Each structure stands twice: as structure tokens, then as C-alpha cells.
């Protein structure tokens, strides 16, 4: 198998936990306890490699120390979660851009940009908005709904491509 180290980020309800058990465990979770942090493993076979993913579902309080540094440099990619319906989580996506930099000590990162929650009825968050900033950065874009599971497979999938591209 190749191990892919992946961290999920983003403010607080966006759906981290929702994706990450979309993808590791196939329902929708409408409540999953909002304090818990883990790591949770997965094989799937992506474009014909046999992949063990390792996925850091990001939770607790905004806390800065040399710990929660080195455990988030451990991370090889970052899936950057906004919501659609939440214009602050798509304001904070820099900040959370900004601190990946910061421990990874460099200005490419494996990174994917994520708008979930597509399946709700009205956006605040445009997908021009959003494809924008990720022209911006040179990372890919995806919007997925971790209730239908609409791109939740892609998404995940992009970002183990955007890390086989840095490896060269
Ligand atoms: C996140 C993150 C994070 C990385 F992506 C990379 C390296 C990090 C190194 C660290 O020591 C700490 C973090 C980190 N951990 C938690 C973090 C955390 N919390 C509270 C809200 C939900 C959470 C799951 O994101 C955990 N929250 C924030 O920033 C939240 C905002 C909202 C209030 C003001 N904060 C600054 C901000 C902006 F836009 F300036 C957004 N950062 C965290 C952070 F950088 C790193
Ligand atoms: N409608 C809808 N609700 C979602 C979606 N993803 C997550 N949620 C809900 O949004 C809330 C927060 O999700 P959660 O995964 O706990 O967010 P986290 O704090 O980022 O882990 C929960 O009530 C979820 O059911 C989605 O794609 N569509
Ligand atoms: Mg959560």
C-alpha cells in the first residue's frame, strides 16, 4: 500500500466529521460530537494504486503549541473545508492556508479547496467566488455534499493526486 497522511480543516460545522465518515464508513452523520479529534484509516485502490489513507478529522479550540505544530506537519495534504450557506467559514479558509504554510515551512502544499453542503437550497458562497480563490492559489476546487455524498470520493481522491504531482 501507499500511506497518504491527509488533514481536514476549517471552522467549526462545515462538515469535517461528515465527510470523513462518508468517506471511511459510507452513512451521513447528523450529529457527530464536535470536540472529537481523530485519525481514521482507510485502503481504496485510486487510479490503480492500492492507497492506505490516514485522515486527521480536525476538532477542539482555536490552541497554538510546538505539539499541535508537529502533529499537523505530519500532514502531506489538506483538504480546506468551507460551507456554501456559511460566508465566515470561506473568509477563514486564508487563515487555515496561512498556518499549513507556516508548519510545512513552504509555499506549495498539497491542498484542495472544498465548498460542502452543494445539497442546501441557497448559497451565500458563489462557485465563481470559490473557483476564484482556488485559481488564486494554484489548487484545485471541489463542491461536495457529505449528506448525498456528491464529490466526497473526488475530493478526497484530488488531493492523493495533488501530493503523487509534489512527490514529481
Ligand atoms: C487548523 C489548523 C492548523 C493548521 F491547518 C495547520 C497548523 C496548525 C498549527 C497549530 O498549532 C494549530 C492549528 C489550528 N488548530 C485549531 C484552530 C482553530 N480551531 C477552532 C475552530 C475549529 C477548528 C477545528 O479549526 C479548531 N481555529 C483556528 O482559527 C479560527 C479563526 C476563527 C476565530 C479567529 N480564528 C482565526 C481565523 C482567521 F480567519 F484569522 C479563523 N485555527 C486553528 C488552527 F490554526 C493549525
Ligand atoms: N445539509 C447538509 N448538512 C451537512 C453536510 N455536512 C455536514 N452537515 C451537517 O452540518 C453539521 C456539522 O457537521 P460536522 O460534520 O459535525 O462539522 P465539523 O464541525 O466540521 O466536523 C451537522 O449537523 C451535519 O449533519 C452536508 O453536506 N449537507
Ligand atoms: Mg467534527
Redesign the pocket.
Given at each position: 500500500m501507499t500511506e497518504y497522511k491527509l488533514?481536514v480543516?476549517?471552522?467549526?460545522g462545515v462538515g469535517?466529521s461528515a465527510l470523513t465518515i462518508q468517506l471511511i464508513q459510507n452513512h451521513f452523520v447528523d450529529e457527530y460530537d464536535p470536540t472529537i479529534?481523530d485519525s481514521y484509516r482507510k485502503q481504496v485502490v485510486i487510479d490503480g494504486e492500492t492507497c492506505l489513507l490516514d485522515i486527521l478529522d480536525?476538532?477542539?479550540?482555536?490552541?497554538?503549541?510546538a505539539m499541535?505544530?508537529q502533529?499537523?506537519?505530519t500532514?502531506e495534504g489538506?483538504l480546506?473545508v468551507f460551507a456554501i450557506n456559511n460566508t465566515?467559514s470561506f473568509?477563514?479558509?486564508?487563515?487555515?492556508?496561512e498556518?499549513?504554510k507556516?508548519?510545512?515551512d513552504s509555499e506549495d502544499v498539497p491542498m484542495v479547496l472544498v465548498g460542502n453542503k452543494c445539497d442546501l437550497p441557497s448559497r451565500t458562497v458563489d462557485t465563481k467566488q470559490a473557483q476564484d480563490l482556488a485559481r488564486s492559489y494554484g489548487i484545485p476546487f471541489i463542491e461536495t455534499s457529505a449528506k448525498t455524498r456528491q464529490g466526497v470520493d473526488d475530493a478526497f481522491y484530488t488531493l492523493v493526486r495533488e501530493i503523487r504531482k509534489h512527490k514529481e
Open positions: 488533514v480543516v476549517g471552522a467549526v469535517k479529534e480536525t476538532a477542539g479550540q482555536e490552541e497554538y503549541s499541535r505544530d502533529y499537523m506537519r500532514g489538506f480546506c465566515k473568509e477563514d479558509i486564508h487563515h487555515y492556508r498556518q499549513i507556516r508548519v510545512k
